[PDB]
Amino acid sequence: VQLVESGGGLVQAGGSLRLSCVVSGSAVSDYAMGWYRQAPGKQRELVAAIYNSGRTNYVDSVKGRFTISKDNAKKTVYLQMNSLKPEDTADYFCNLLGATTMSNAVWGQGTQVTVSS
Numbered sequence: 001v002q003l004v005e006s007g008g009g010l011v012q013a014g015g016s017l018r019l020s021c022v023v024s025g026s027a028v029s030d031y032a033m034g035w036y037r038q039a040p041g042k043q044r045e046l047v048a049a050i051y052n053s054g055r056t057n058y059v060d061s062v063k064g065r066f067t068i069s070k071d072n073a074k075k076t077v078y079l080q081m082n083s084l085k086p087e088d089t090a091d092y093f094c095n096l097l098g099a100t101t102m103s104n105a106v107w108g109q110g111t112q113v114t115v116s117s
Helices: none
Strands: 003-006 009-011 017-023 033-038 045-050 056-058 066-071 076-081 090-096 111-115
Touching: 003 090, 017 033, 017 090, 017 111, 033 066, 033 076, 045 066, 045 076, 056 066, 076 090
Parallel strands: 009 111
Antiparallel strands: 003 017, 017 076, 033 045, 033 090, 045 056, 066 076, 090 111
């Protein structure tokens, strides 16, 4: 299962970006996926999750601003990031839900997001 992230950039506070994660195989159609982020020198954290049923869950700090969705045909998980804040600056990664909990997790290259002033 390969993970390929894209969509980062440098934007002003209040701006918007759309991250995408293309997954090989049928994992998007069969398993819950999550978007994670790690700011320099801080611990990686789950930002948004989308379950097999289509149900979603977000950390309180992004609720109402970020929206996670998926397209089974395109094997892609999206993170629409609106009303970006400087606290959202981080490297963003997507992976199976439960990959971070297990030991010896494999991650992709990620995509970098910077929200300036």
